[PDB]
Amino acid sequence: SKAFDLVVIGAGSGGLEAGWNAATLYGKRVAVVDVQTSHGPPFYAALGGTCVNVGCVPKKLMVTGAQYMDHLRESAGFGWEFDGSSVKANWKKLIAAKNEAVLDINKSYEGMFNDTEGLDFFLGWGSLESKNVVVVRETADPKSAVKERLQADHILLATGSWPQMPAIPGIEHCISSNEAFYLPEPPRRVLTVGGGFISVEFAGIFNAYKPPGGKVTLCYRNNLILRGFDETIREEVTKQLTANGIEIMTNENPAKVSLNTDGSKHVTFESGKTLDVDVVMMAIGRIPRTNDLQLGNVGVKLTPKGGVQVDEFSRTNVPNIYAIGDITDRLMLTPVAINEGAALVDTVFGNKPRKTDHTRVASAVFSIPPIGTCGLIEEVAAKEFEKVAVYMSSFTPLMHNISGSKYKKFVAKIVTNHSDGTVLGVHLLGDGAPEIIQAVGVCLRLNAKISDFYNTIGVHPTSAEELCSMRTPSYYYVKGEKMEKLPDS
Amino acid sequence: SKAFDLVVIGAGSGGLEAGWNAATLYGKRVAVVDVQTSHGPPFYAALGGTCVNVGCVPKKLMVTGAQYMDHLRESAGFGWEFDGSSVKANWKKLIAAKNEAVLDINKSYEGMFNDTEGLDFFLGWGSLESKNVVVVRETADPKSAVKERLQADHILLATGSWPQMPAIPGIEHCISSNEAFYLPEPPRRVLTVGGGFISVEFAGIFNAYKPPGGKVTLCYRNNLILRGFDETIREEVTKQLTANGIEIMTNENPAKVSLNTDGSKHVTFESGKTLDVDVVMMAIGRIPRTNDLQLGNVGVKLTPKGGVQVDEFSRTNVPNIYAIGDITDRLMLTPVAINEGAALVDTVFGNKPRKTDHTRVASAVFSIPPIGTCGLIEEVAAKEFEKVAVYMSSFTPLMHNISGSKYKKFVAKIVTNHSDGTVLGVHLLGDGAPEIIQAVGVCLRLNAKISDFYNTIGVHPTSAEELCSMRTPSYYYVKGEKMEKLPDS
Ligand SMILES: Cc1cc2nc3c(=O)[nH]c(=O)nc-3n(C[C@H](O)[C@H](O)[C@H](O)COP(=O)(O)OP(=O)(O)OC[C@H]3O[C@@H](n4cnc5c(N)ncnc54)[C@H](O)[C@@H]3O)c2cc1C
Ligand SMILES: Cc1cc2nc3c(=O)[nH]c(=O)nc-3n(C[C@H](O)[C@H](O)[C@H](O)COP(=O)(O)OP(=O)(O)OC[C@H]3O[C@@H](n4cnc5c(N)ncnc54)[C@H](O)[C@@H]3O)c2cc1C
């Protein structure tokens, strides 16, 4: 067995940050375990994590590809002429370019390990033998051959999450986001199941790359997609996906899937409705990846919903064992996992406690058009504060009247504590929204007030200047009650 | 003769804000004077101002159209196929769409005047008869017939600026940005004269719409374009314009222009080099429009360079006469002019003095790719502060390695006071830059430190998140001198 200050199980976003920082900033001896060195089947995730291999990085490339469908059409309003009937979207090329880009990242990460002293990679499946020993095996099977036994002063659990699949008849005919990344050809008809960001993101990707006579359908078991997001924006994204040819089935959920004779899938819904598609993609949730770690050997406690139970400092109930990222089933974001890994390492090896702030985190949805958001939505804020103000701007930007995409209304909302003007949340929908919101996150850290926004001089002409052009609330909540104007008193 | 609380000469960015505020917020009687009711020849600007008619608004629509040249090309990396030889950029269509959009704004300003009590528009040329009378005439000639005599308690000068044309033989064969907006056809060969934002922005526009066998040349009298901007950005923009097929002639300046027998232009540079082009667009500066105001009648004082001299509250040497916007030859931006207009009105009619902060104003250049900037460049900071740190990131984002535009390095630079970490300037080059910098403007009003950026959680994947990923200075200025590391002293 080999001895290490820190052993990390999972070479993903959080795991690599922790490992890199411990080794290069604190001079510790670090071991990092992952199940394969490059993306794709059989394990999908790999060295670099979910985000690099089957997540943020590849899907952003694919969304960027999808945006060209809109660009090509929209150029005509600006005088661009070309043979429309010659236009074809080559999925095979997209996927091949994506694969090369992901592989290049895989390769650079193994170059990092090769070049970095005291930071070593171990290929295999990690699990807990005792509270000081990580065993590395050939496969996920607990009975597979032992490759390595790693003695660890500290153990970090960073194995992320995995797609949830519903227990319905014909689930074997369905796929998840994992497989979506490797489809040999683009589906003519596809059902995306779920109303969260993965389902909305992929619907837009499939919508652009669909062969002729194609149809993308997204279904969601409740009334309105994208729960947790601003309600205006939820309603507007629904309208804007619809206007780009995507069918949105709300209050619907698959009961059953079967094969048609030609090989296509026949979906039956709980309500009795039916749909024939070429691909059914489940995006109904991601669950912490705890099953292979043999946590019962050491008694690391889990949450009711299956995450590793931690405190604010990422500590489990076992003293030298920690958990960060998706395995904790909190905020499933890459930069949050990274921030968590860095704080952990500062605490443990730097001996100066640091915890990640999980509030006021800026995030994005790469829908078409995209969402950018930071902080509280108005419903949540109205429950915590007696007086809240909402500043709303919503209209089609000029260039989209010219482009023909008149449906692309840009939404900008600011939610404040109206007692002192403190900005509680900012919510954006439209082109550039993810890029705009980043520095907004810095503003909220500094406890910006609405006056800090409107007293800042705009950049003209942009969409972002709308954030600096709102002085009078559109409406209020007074102890939970929505109203246009404050009572005369 | 008509009596008014406020008479505004010039119905542009600053004038309209001031007029609207005085009428609607303070209930004053206001007159606003402009020379045209809609955009275009002979006087180009009109109701709405330079920005609405021959500036920011149409310019941005035209750059947006220009971006499609890149989009169509870059789509191929993501699998998009089409008949490339069928591609045509219809300049006439762009201009027609631009015109309708501008005209729509012209028309809406007329409804504003009609619906608003005590806010009236007068068509004609405004000038000062005396301290308390603005005279409106048919033309700029002070001998032309009087249309109106407006008795004014207060007078606001807001006539903006006008293109500078060098005194060279054959200047009559050259145009400015004004005429560029109305060219009947797109020029095959064009020379844009100047290294500032207008010359660069139009170079990009003409480059996208040029007919077959076209060439855009930009010339600049000194060594490196875009003086006043970040040095890394100046160098990068030069590289990236060149890579998109624009010729940049540095250390060259037109000495004369003559008309060829085919109507094209023969340019001779001070060096003796020559170049044949179809259009010569002068973009060597903009100078305050003071001549037609007959300021000598009242003795309003001008600065050495020709602007109306004002204090920080926009007051002239004459108590009831004020000046804002480009006529003051300070910061020539629409939102600054607007902010000055609002502050002046609060001061004069609210009797609570307010002034515009001309520091840390965010701004953009809509080059391809675009620049976004706020605050000080490092050479300027190194003079005001004893120790400054520069945080720098410059690389081609993944998508542009796939797109084929490998020359598109995104540049992010933060300049700080290294004594306390206070952010002094932020400078960006690349897609989204103008949108990213807006909320950065808010951050600098809040006196953000570098640590406020790097302790903010990133939105991934974005270009903007680079701003939150820089912890270690790339280099420093100590007592005005550049060095990679701080001295041990
Ligand atoms: C389709 C999709 C799109 C997404 N888009 C975004 C986005 O746009 N922005 C964003 O911020 N986030 C996005 N995410 C979420 C983001 O990918 C995760 O939040 C982040 O990757 C979690 O990081 P982590 O360190 O917790 O784990 P991961 O990055 O998932 O890394 C866990 C690693 O552990 C390995 N592993 C698992 N079991 C073992 C074992 N027992 N032994 C050894 N190794 C093991 C896995 O192979 C994996 O590489 C997306 C996710 C998906 C699925
Ligand atoms: C090509 C170009 C691109 C630009 N791009 C941007 C940009 O992207 N972002 C930005 O912030 N700024 C931009 N600007 C600058 C911006 O347009 C100006 O800073 C702004 O319009 C100035 O506002 P103003 O109120 O001072 O004057 P203006 O908006 O120019 O208004 C002055 C008005 O007064 C009228 N007038 C003149 N003389 C008389 C007279 N004697 N009697 C009656 N009326 C008169 C004129 O017709 C004009 O309408 C651009 C300018 C140009 C030329």
PDB file of C-alpha atoms in Angstrom, chain A residues 51 56-57 59-61 64-66 68-69 71-72 74-83 86-90 93-94 97-98 101 105 208-209 334-336 339 354 356-357 361-364 366 398-399 402-403 432 434-443 445-446 448 451-453 455-465 468, chain B residues 51 56-57 59-61 64-66 68-69 71-72 74-83 86-91 93-94 97 101 105 208-209 334-336 339 356-357 361-364 366 398-399 402-403 431-432 434-443 445-446 448 451-453 455-465 468:
ATOM      1  CA  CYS A  51     -18.687  18.748 -16.790  1.00  0.00           C
ATOM      2  CA  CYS A  56     -21.180  21.851 -19.340  1.00  0.00           C
ATOM      3  CA  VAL A  57     -18.289  21.807 -21.829  1.00  0.00           C
ATOM      4  CA  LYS A  59     -23.262  20.717 -24.261  1.00  0.00           C
ATOM      5  CA  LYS A  60     -22.213  24.364 -24.557  1.00  0.00           C
ATOM      6  CA  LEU A  61     -20.409  23.480 -27.797  1.00  0.00           C
ATOM      7  CA  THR A  64     -23.464  26.951 -29.853  1.00  0.00           C
ATOM      8  CA  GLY A  65     -23.894  24.688 -32.894  1.00  0.00           C
ATOM      9  CA  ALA A  66     -27.683  24.806 -32.463  1.00  0.00           C
ATOM     10  CA  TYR A  68     -26.637  28.654 -36.057  1.00  0.00           C
ATOM     11  CA  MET A  69     -30.128  27.521 -37.063  1.00  0.00           C
ATOM     12  CA  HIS A  71     -28.401  32.826 -37.053  1.00  0.00           C
ATOM     13  CA  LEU A  72     -28.838  31.490 -40.597  1.00  0.00           C
ATOM     14  CA  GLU A  74     -32.030  35.745 -38.866  1.00  0.00           C
ATOM     15  CA  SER A  75     -29.306  36.941 -41.265  1.00  0.00           C
ATOM     16  CA  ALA A  76     -31.891  37.444 -44.030  1.00  0.00           C
ATOM     17  CA  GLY A  77     -33.383  40.471 -42.238  1.00  0.00           C
ATOM     18  CA  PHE A  78     -29.921  42.049 -42.420  1.00  0.00           C
ATOM     19  CA  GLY A  79     -29.596  41.436 -46.158  1.00  0.00           C
ATOM     20  CA  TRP A  80     -27.843  38.079 -46.218  1.00  0.00           C
ATOM     21  CA  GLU A  81     -28.861  35.955 -49.194  1.00  0.00           C
ATOM     22  CA  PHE A  82     -28.026  32.301 -49.859  1.00  0.00           C
ATOM     23  CA  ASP A  83     -29.701  29.096 -51.071  1.00  0.00           C
ATOM     24  CA  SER A  86     -28.987  23.741 -49.530  1.00  0.00           C
ATOM     25  CA  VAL A  87     -28.843  24.098 -45.727  1.00  0.00           C
ATOM     26  CA  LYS A  88     -28.106  20.926 -43.773  1.00  0.00           C
ATOM     27  CA  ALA A  89     -27.024  20.418 -40.155  1.00  0.00           C
ATOM     28  CA  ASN A  90     -24.425  17.653 -39.896  1.00  0.00           C
ATOM     29  CA  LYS A  93     -19.504  16.473 -37.729  1.00  0.00           C
ATOM     30  CA  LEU A  94     -20.716  18.245 -34.587  1.00  0.00           C
ATOM     31  CA  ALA A  97     -15.600  17.971 -33.268  1.00  0.00           C
ATOM     32  CA  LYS A  98     -17.006  17.763 -29.743  1.00  0.00           C
ATOM     33  CA  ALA A 101     -12.295  18.890 -28.019  1.00  0.00           C
ATOM     34  CA  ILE A 105      -8.983  18.143 -22.345  1.00  0.00           C
ATOM     35  CA  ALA A 208     -31.663  22.560 -34.548  1.00  0.00           C
ATOM     36  CA  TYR A 209     -30.071  19.337 -35.746  1.00  0.00           C
ATOM     37  CA  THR A 334     -19.292  23.014 -11.478  1.00  0.00           C
ATOM     38  CA  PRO A 335     -17.990  26.280  -9.979  1.00  0.00           C
ATOM     39  CA  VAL A 336     -19.737  25.466  -6.691  1.00  0.00           C
ATOM     40  CA  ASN A 339     -15.260  26.530  -4.623  1.00  0.00           C
ATOM     41  CA  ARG A 354     -13.409  28.496   5.012  1.00  0.00           C
ATOM     42  CA  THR A 356     -18.602  27.999   0.548  1.00  0.00           C
ATOM     43  CA  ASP A 357     -21.425  30.557   0.367  1.00  0.00           C
ATOM     44  CA  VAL A 361     -24.596  32.149  -6.777  1.00  0.00           C
ATOM     45  CA  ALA A 362     -24.872  33.234 -10.409  1.00  0.00           C
ATOM     46  CA  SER A 363     -25.977  30.496 -12.822  1.00  0.00           C
ATOM     47  CA  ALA A 364     -27.212  30.028 -16.392  1.00  0.00           C
ATOM     48  CA  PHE A 366     -28.194  27.537 -22.142  1.00  0.00           C
ATOM     49  CA  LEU A 398     -34.790  46.202 -32.049  1.00  0.00           C
ATOM     50  CA  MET A 399     -32.520  43.790 -33.940  1.00  0.00           C
ATOM     51  CA  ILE A 402     -35.492  43.139 -37.957  1.00  0.00           C
ATOM     52  CA  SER A 403     -34.339  39.499 -37.718  1.00  0.00           C
ATOM     53  CA  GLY A 432     -25.955  37.360 -23.588  1.00  0.00           C
ATOM     54  CA  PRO A 434     -25.186  34.297 -18.932  1.00  0.00           C
ATOM     55  CA  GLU A 435     -22.376  36.752 -19.706  1.00  0.00           C
ATOM     56  CA  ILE A 436     -24.244  39.710 -18.185  1.00  0.00           C
ATOM     57  CA  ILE A 437     -25.022  37.971 -14.888  1.00  0.00           C
ATOM     58  CA  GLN A 438     -21.415  37.140 -13.928  1.00  0.00           C
ATOM     59  CA  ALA A 439     -20.469  40.616 -12.695  1.00  0.00           C
ATOM     60  CA  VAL A 440     -23.972  40.878 -11.216  1.00  0.00           C
ATOM     61  CA  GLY A 441     -22.832  38.108  -8.860  1.00  0.00           C
ATOM     62  CA  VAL A 442     -19.964  40.361  -7.773  1.00  0.00           C
ATOM     63  CA  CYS A 443     -22.476  43.194  -7.180  1.00  0.00           C
ATOM     64  CA  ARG A 445     -21.528  39.996  -2.890  1.00  0.00           C
ATOM     65  CA  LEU A 446     -20.975  43.726  -2.253  1.00  0.00           C
ATOM     66  CA  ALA A 448     -25.471  46.369  -3.993  1.00  0.00           C
ATOM     67  CA  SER A 451     -29.579  52.888  -6.614  1.00  0.00           C
ATOM     68  CA  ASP A 452     -26.094  51.511  -7.265  1.00  0.00           C
ATOM     69  CA  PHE A 453     -27.623  50.090 -10.449  1.00  0.00           C
ATOM     70  CA  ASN A 455     -26.849  55.575 -10.671  1.00  0.00           C
ATOM     71  CA  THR A 456     -24.404  53.610 -12.806  1.00  0.00           C
ATOM     72  CA  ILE A 457     -24.105  55.005 -16.327  1.00  0.00           C
ATOM     73  CA  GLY A 458     -25.294  52.618 -19.055  1.00  0.00           C
ATOM     74  CA  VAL A 459     -23.309  51.086 -21.899  1.00  0.00           C
ATOM     75  CA  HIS A 460     -25.206  51.989 -25.063  1.00  0.00           C
ATOM     76  CA  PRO A 461     -26.564  50.225 -26.938  1.00  0.00           C
ATOM     77  CA  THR A 462     -26.741  46.927 -25.012  1.00  0.00           C
ATOM     78  CA  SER A 463     -29.299  44.674 -23.342  1.00  0.00           C
ATOM     79  CA  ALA A 464     -27.361  44.998 -20.084  1.00  0.00           C
ATOM     80  CA  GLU A 465     -28.086  48.731 -19.735  1.00  0.00           C
ATOM     81  CA  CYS A 468     -29.286  50.489 -15.001  1.00  0.00           C
TER      82      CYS A 468
ATOM     83  CA  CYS B  51     -27.210  58.512 -31.641  1.00  0.00           C
ATOM     84  CA  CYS B  56     -25.106  54.291 -31.848  1.00  0.00           C
ATOM     85  CA  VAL B  57     -28.511  52.934 -32.914  1.00  0.00           C
ATOM     86  CA  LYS B  59     -24.370  51.699 -36.233  1.00  0.00           C
ATOM     87  CA  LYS B  60     -25.151  48.772 -33.907  1.00  0.00           C
ATOM     88  CA  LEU B  61     -27.763  47.362 -36.303  1.00  0.00           C
ATOM     89  CA  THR B  64     -24.975  43.103 -36.096  1.00  0.00           C
ATOM     90  CA  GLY B  65     -25.557  42.568 -39.827  1.00  0.00           C
ATOM     91  CA  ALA B  66     -21.773  42.479 -40.358  1.00  0.00           C
ATOM     92  CA  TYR B  68     -23.253  37.354 -40.010  1.00  0.00           C
ATOM     93  CA  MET B  69     -20.236  37.104 -42.322  1.00  0.00           C
ATOM     94  CA  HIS B  71     -21.452  33.412 -38.349  1.00  0.00           C
ATOM     95  CA  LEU B  72     -22.002  31.884 -41.797  1.00  0.00           C
ATOM     96  CA  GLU B  74     -17.999  29.711 -38.432  1.00  0.00           C
ATOM     97  CA  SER B  75     -21.149  27.565 -38.634  1.00  0.00           C
ATOM     98  CA  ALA B  76     -19.214  25.030 -40.764  1.00  0.00           C
ATOM     99  CA  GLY B  77     -17.077  23.934 -37.781  1.00  0.00           C
ATOM    100  CA  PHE B  78     -20.298  22.878 -36.053  1.00  0.00           C
ATOM    101  CA  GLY B  79     -21.574  20.807 -38.965  1.00  0.00           C
ATOM    102  CA  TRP B  80     -23.580  23.364 -40.931  1.00  0.00           C
ATOM    103  CA  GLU B  81     -23.439  22.861 -44.678  1.00  0.00           C
ATOM    104  CA  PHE B  82     -24.722  25.103 -47.450  1.00  0.00           C
ATOM    105  CA  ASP B  83     -23.868  26.485 -50.874  1.00  0.00           C
ATOM    106  CA  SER B  86     -24.634  31.416 -53.262  1.00  0.00           C
ATOM    107  CA  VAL B  87     -23.841  33.782 -50.368  1.00  0.00           C
ATOM    108  CA  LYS B  88     -24.538  37.464 -51.027  1.00  0.00           C
ATOM    109  CA  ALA B  89     -24.557  40.410 -48.611  1.00  0.00           C
ATOM    110  CA  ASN B  90     -27.347  42.743 -49.732  1.00  0.00           C
ATOM    111  CA  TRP B  91     -26.263  46.194 -48.545  1.00  0.00           C
ATOM    112  CA  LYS B  93     -31.580  45.614 -47.759  1.00  0.00           C
ATOM    113  CA  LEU B  94     -29.530  46.405 -44.631  1.00  0.00           C
ATOM    114  CA  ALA B  97     -34.172  47.954 -42.720  1.00  0.00           C
ATOM    115  CA  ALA B 101     -36.149  51.328 -37.726  1.00  0.00           C
ATOM    116  CA  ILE B 105     -38.016  56.175 -33.526  1.00  0.00           C
ATOM    117  CA  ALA B 208     -18.694  42.262 -44.351  1.00  0.00           C
ATOM    118  CA  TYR B 209     -20.752  43.932 -47.079  1.00  0.00           C
ATOM    119  CA  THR B 334     -24.985  59.079 -25.221  1.00  0.00           C
ATOM    120  CA  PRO B 335     -25.549  57.846 -21.635  1.00  0.00           C
ATOM    121  CA  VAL B 336     -23.158  60.490 -20.270  1.00  0.00           C
ATOM    122  CA  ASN B 339     -26.914  61.693 -17.189  1.00  0.00           C
ATOM    123  CA  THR B 356     -22.279  63.663 -13.348  1.00  0.00           C
ATOM    124  CA  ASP B 357     -19.333  61.449 -12.406  1.00  0.00           C
ATOM    125  CA  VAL B 361     -17.920  55.117 -17.012  1.00  0.00           C
ATOM    126  CA  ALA B 362     -18.339  51.806 -18.818  1.00  0.00           C
ATOM    127  CA  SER B 363     -18.150  51.857 -22.618  1.00  0.00           C
ATOM    128  CA  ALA B 364     -17.815  49.701 -25.724  1.00  0.00           C
ATOM    129  CA  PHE B 366     -18.510  47.528 -31.558  1.00  0.00           C
ATOM    130  CA  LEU B 398     -12.653  26.553 -27.269  1.00  0.00           C
ATOM    131  CA  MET B 399     -15.557  27.364 -29.601  1.00  0.00           C
ATOM    132  CA  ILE B 402     -13.737  24.618 -33.623  1.00  0.00           C
ATOM    133  CA  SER B 403     -15.237  27.508 -35.618  1.00  0.00           C
ATOM    134  CA  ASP B 431     -17.729  38.241 -28.029  1.00  0.00           C
ATOM    135  CA  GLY B 432     -19.953  39.582 -25.261  1.00  0.00           C
ATOM    136  CA  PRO B 434     -19.928  45.114 -24.118  1.00  0.00           C
ATOM    137  CA  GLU B 435     -22.566  43.088 -22.255  1.00  0.00           C
ATOM    138  CA  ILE B 436     -20.115  41.832 -19.619  1.00  0.00           C
ATOM    139  CA  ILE B 437     -18.708  45.269 -18.765  1.00  0.00           C
ATOM    140  CA  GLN B 438     -22.049  46.843 -17.815  1.00  0.00           C
ATOM    141  CA  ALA B 439     -22.347  45.344 -14.335  1.00  0.00           C
ATOM    142  CA  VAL B 440     -18.572  45.783 -13.939  1.00  0.00           C
ATOM    143  CA  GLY B 441     -19.428  49.492 -14.048  1.00  0.00           C
ATOM    144  CA  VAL B 442     -21.629  48.880 -11.000  1.00  0.00           C
ATOM    145  CA  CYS B 443     -18.775  47.021  -9.266  1.00  0.00           C
ATOM    146  CA  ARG B 445     -19.021  52.357  -8.172  1.00  0.00           C
ATOM    147  CA  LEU B 446     -19.028  50.007  -5.186  1.00  0.00           C
ATOM    148  CA  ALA B 448     -14.762  46.481  -5.634  1.00  0.00           C
ATOM    149  CA  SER B 451     -10.765  39.697  -4.092  1.00  0.00           C
ATOM    150  CA  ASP B 452     -14.422  40.622  -4.582  1.00  0.00           C
ATOM    151  CA  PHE B 453     -14.003  39.216  -8.100  1.00  0.00           C
ATOM    152  CA  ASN B 455     -14.258  35.216  -4.289  1.00  0.00           C
ATOM    153  CA  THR B 456     -17.352  35.378  -6.507  1.00  0.00           C
ATOM    154  CA  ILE B 457     -18.446  32.000  -7.884  1.00  0.00           C
ATOM    155  CA  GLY B 458     -18.223  31.761 -11.689  1.00  0.00           C
ATOM    156  CA  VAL B 459     -20.973  31.104 -14.209  1.00  0.00           C
ATOM    157  CA  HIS B 460     -19.671  28.210 -16.302  1.00  0.00           C
ATOM    158  CA  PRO B 461     -19.007  28.015 -19.161  1.00  0.00           C
ATOM    159  CA  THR B 462     -18.658  31.726 -20.038  1.00  0.00           C
ATOM    160  CA  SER B 463     -15.986  34.204 -21.075  1.00  0.00           C
ATOM    161  CA  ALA B 464     -17.077  36.427 -18.175  1.00  0.00           C
ATOM    162  CA  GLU B 465     -15.970  33.893 -15.531  1.00  0.00           C
ATOM    163  CA  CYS B 468     -13.436  35.757 -11.325  1.00  0.00           C
TER     164      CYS B 468
END
